[PDB]
RNA sequence: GGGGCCUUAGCUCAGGGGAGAGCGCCUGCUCGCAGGAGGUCAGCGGUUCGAUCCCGCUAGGCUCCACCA
RNA sequence: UCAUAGGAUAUGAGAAGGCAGACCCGGGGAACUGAAACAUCUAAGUACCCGGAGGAAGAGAAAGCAAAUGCGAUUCCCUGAGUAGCGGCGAGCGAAACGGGAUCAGCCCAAACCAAGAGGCUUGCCUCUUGGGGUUGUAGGACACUCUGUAGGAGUUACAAA
RNA sequence: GUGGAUCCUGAGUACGGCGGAACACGUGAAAUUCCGUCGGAAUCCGGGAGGACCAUCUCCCAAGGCUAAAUACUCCCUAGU
RNA sequence: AAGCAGAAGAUGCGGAGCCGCAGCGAAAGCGAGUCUGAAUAGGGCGCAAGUACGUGGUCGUAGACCCGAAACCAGGUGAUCUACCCAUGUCCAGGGUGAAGUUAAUGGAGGCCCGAACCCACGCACGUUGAAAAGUGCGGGGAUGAGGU
RNA sequence: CGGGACCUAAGCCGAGGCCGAAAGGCGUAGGCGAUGGACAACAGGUUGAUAUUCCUGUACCACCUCCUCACCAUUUGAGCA
RNA sequence: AGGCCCAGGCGACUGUUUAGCAAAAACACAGGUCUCUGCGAAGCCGUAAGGCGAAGUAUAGGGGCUGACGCCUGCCCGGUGCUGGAAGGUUAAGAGGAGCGCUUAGCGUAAGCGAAGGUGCGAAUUGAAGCCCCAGUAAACGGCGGCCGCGGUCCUAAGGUAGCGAAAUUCCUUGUCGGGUAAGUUCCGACCCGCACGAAAGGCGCAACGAUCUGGGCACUGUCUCAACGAGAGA
RNA sequence: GAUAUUGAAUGUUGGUAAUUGACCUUCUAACCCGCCGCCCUUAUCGGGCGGGGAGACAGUGUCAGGUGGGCAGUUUGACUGGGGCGGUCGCCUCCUAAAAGGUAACGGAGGCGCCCAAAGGUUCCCUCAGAAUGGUUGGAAAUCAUUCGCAGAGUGUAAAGGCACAAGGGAGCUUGACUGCGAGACCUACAAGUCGAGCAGGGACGAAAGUCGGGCUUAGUGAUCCGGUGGUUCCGCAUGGA
């Protein structure tokens, strides 16, 4: 009841369900695997669960959408308890190209919910996707086209997964509106519109406060400029602006 | 009057090593591209191997003081 | 309910209060001041308040001092010595023992145990109250032994008390 | 006076931790003494002290009491300086 | 020296104690030397008249040449003045206005009005070694109230 | 007449009691405490100096019984309370 | 035995106050609001006992601010306070003793090693409130922008709304214009470049009230032009 | 918050070999009641007795942390053409400074709170700035070459005094940027500061003479107390240790 204040009002929905997962693992003494919780929902769950222990794995290390195991003080989990299936996306690579937008659009097009798949990995040699094992056969059967490319899915082990723009700058403050303006190369008044409407996120939390102070190692997500990361804050200049470093995706 | 701070390209700002970056403005190309435009670095005189970034002064603009009989 | 609380009556040269503005032992306890400021510190356990006294008080018969072919209760004086030491190691604070003197004195219990009685029988055990017993350190006492005294010695200043 | 079969010889004490005070000694290397609090012995094959502490040695026997004199003082009284 | 004897004396006794006769070194220690140092070196400090008592000068600790704060602390004494409160009394000439209510009249409200006592103290003058350590005179405010006493 | 031998308010004191280094603080029963309640005497006269106080006249209140009279009554028995 | 009138500031009012240089625009006030307080209330006095609160009980009691009435009371929760709180971080005594030192029975030609006990330190681990942190809250403390050409741009927690404005606030200033006067640094009304108003440390109005402050009139006068005479007290 | 007062049970979860912890719930008997009835007792005190409530909590004690101008004791510099405000405070160099030395002002100018493992030591060798004339890049100015050339350069750094038998530049080998000291001087209120031949130990460089106890010279620093570290033929509170 006195947890919601710490999160947003829309985020209440997840928090209610996150409390219902903790309820199970305490009383029934059994691990609860979840449906690839979003990077934000990782942060929320971590809080709602409390310290019921928690584990998280999205197949490869550095998956955005990862599935969480809520386990007690015993039954420390394995890599396959997360019920993850990796696939290699086969297509006529010489003729057609698959991009992240097309493959994401195709996954959604076959009716797959965002919670039923993790990250879509693009390397030089392979395009791979990670899904929940319960949906693996459905996705393999239905995902026959991505954009203009005819595609097929080959099952692989997680071990077979084939896993910047540094921009040293100065800002007046570490307010959100100031950092966005700097990163996105805009007027601050324009950046304030972005923040206020609800287009910027900070670690996948929608921050609508222009004056929110941004810390070192915060993934900002300006809808319109993509995504960028305050990696370094490096003291202050002669004329008193924060020496900073940005790295766009 | 005294102290304290400021003076960089159209605009916003980076920056003892020979003055940049974005945006605007121009180049051709149709939300990104592709090269330009533009600086007495307030000025002055000097420290020196070179000064926007030393150091001393002059502007100007702000800021704080100018009290006690 | 037994009781007990409470109430009543009797007997008490029982207490109370005072002061000598002193001395003594306790409880509580400043500040100015000094430190060339000031907080630790100092002033000072002072002043002051309170309680208790007594003609004196307090201390006192080694769980001591010491480091000798030792000393032998305590108190007080001389000395040790402005030493040792303590100390924003500042300002300041400051011993003790030995040595020399004054004066001198040593005692009683508690306990073991014994005897008698009482009330809890916990049922031959336990607790309590009188009297005896006993009093200490290279241990003493109980307890046993054999001795020995029961009236010479001691006494109201402790060591019983008129 | 002689014996050491047993028994007795001061317990919520000594002592310790924490917090204070007293010791010339200000927490210090800090013995010793006392108070509050909490913990808490041994008991003669025992215990205490000798300035942290241990060992050895030496000296002593706490946690019960009493005790004159030498000492302090003078509102007074007497005699005097 | 205390102390004992002795006029509250001198004095006698009393050698514990004190200072000096040897220094050097932090110290163990060594000693006319010693410390430093590897050193017979060099250098430091030493070697090569005190003491007891008295007078005087000065210093220390004491109030310390005398007089003087504003203050600080401790323990008492004061609410007969004054502040507020509590209990219980008491005071407020006269006149006016005319709320509610009642049936234009009636009615008699009020930190209501004018205005003595009473309370107050706004202005000015006077007084200022006063009549008076806060007043007097002329005016002034409140005067049934959060009133005076 | 005013006060006491009557009453109580505020407050104060306070057996036992509660609390507190000491001293003490607080407080019950119970008291004290008028500024309040209650309560019987008036007019005139008089002295240099007192007067509901003395004097004159006429009163009233409480209490008492050597007495007088009437009435009621001696254990459902007056009456007091 | 009332002088009166016109106009303005302040405070609504009657009250109250610096005994003895200030009576006021200061305090109080009825009204408003915020807040605490479930009763052995909170608050307060007292070491406590005992009390007040109250012989009351949320329509009550305490505290803060505001100050009749009328219209109203804007924006900012970053900071500070208050209230509440999830993760994460931090943190006392106490608890806990892994280790280590000193000591020495023993053991070693010595050097040194070294049981047990005593003793002196002692790490991990554990450990509340609080704090960091997060959320709310402005009739809480407070704060309510620059620059350039309504737009741009920088900065901020957010940039002053309504109303008022040379004001008990305006330095410059005797601002400017108008009114009143023969002549008006004061006064009144406008204006707004508000040095440095502004919404309960309330804003703007406001009838009644004032020994309030301020400007102007009528009346009146020895206040004055400008003095003169008389009475009394002192001299 | 710990701990005492402070107990009993049931669960559950630690840690030791069945005892002792931790926490949850329950219990009643301590403790509490500014609740009711009864009694002491004419009593809204107090106490006793019986109900009820609450309960090992609270309260109180000790200890601990937090908060805490509610309260307490204090501090809050000096110079200064009055004080405040501004500026300054130690060290070095120059000028003022009057041809020894010293010498003031909120007089005039600047530096310092280091740097360097060579930018120290020694041995050997050397000479700089700039200009003229000639040169593919290449220019006024890089690199040659020639002549001229008291220094017009350099000397880690401020300035002054010095320095070309170099104190300036280069190279080799090195660690004397030594230990013990020190006749005697300078400076000086003290405290400190400065110079020093020479002696010993053991070195570096050099054939040797010799030079070397940092740097061309003069700034580059801070008393005591207290505490840390290393060393130590010292002391060690009966003795041996500590
Ligand atoms: K010598
Ligand atoms: K003398
Ligand atoms: K002057």
From Swiss-Prot:
GO biological process: rescue of stalled ribosome; ribosomal small subunit biogenesis
Domain S4 RNA-binding: residue ranges: 174-244
Main location: cytoplasm
Presence of keyword Cytoplasm: yes
CDD domains per record: S4
Effect of deleting the gene: No alteration in cell division. Has a synthetic lethal phenotype when disrupted simultaneously with trans- translation; double ssrA-ylmH deletions grow poorly at 37 and die at 49 degrees Celsius.
Region (N-terminal domain): 1-71
Region named Central region: 84-163
Keywords: Cytoplasm, Protein biosynthesis, Ribosome biogenesis, RNA-binding, rRNA-binding, tRNA-binding
One cellular-component annotation, GO: small ribosomal subunit
Signal peptide: none
SUPFAM superfamilies associated with the record: Alpha-L RNA-binding motif
Gene3D superfamilies: 3.30.1370.160, 3.30.70.330, RNA-binding S4 domain
Subcellular location: Cytoplasm
GO terms for MF: ribosomal large subunit binding; rRNA binding; structural constituent of ribosome; tRNA binding
Subunit: In the presence of chloramphenicol (a translation elongation inhibitor), but not erythromycin or lincomycin, associates with 50S ribosomal subunits with or without a tRNA in the P-site. The S4 domain binds in a similar position to RqcP.
Free-text function comment from the UniProt entry: Part of the ribosome quality control system (RQC), a ribosome-associated complex that mediates the extraction of incompletely synthesized nascent chains from stalled ribosomes and their subsequent degradation. RqcH recruits Ala-charged tRNA, and with RqcP directs the elongation of stalled nascent chains on 50S ribosomal subunits, leading to non-templated C-terminal alanine extensions (Ala tail). The Ala tail promotes nascent chain degradation. RqcP2 (YlmH) overexpression can compensate for RqcP's role in Ala tailing during RQC, restoring Ala tail addition to peptides in stalled ribosomes.
Entry's free-text remark on domains: Has 3 domains, an N-terminal domain (NTD) which contacts helix 69 (H69) of the 23S rRNA, the central region which contains an RNA recognition motif (RRM) and the C-terminal S4 domain which interacts with the P-site tRNA and H69. The NTD and central region are required to complement a double ssrA-ylmH deletion and to bind 50S ribosomal subunits. The ribosome binding site of the S4 domain overlaps that of RqcP.
Name of the molecule in the record: Ribosome-associated protein quality control protein P2
Provenance organism: Bacillus subtilis (strain 168)
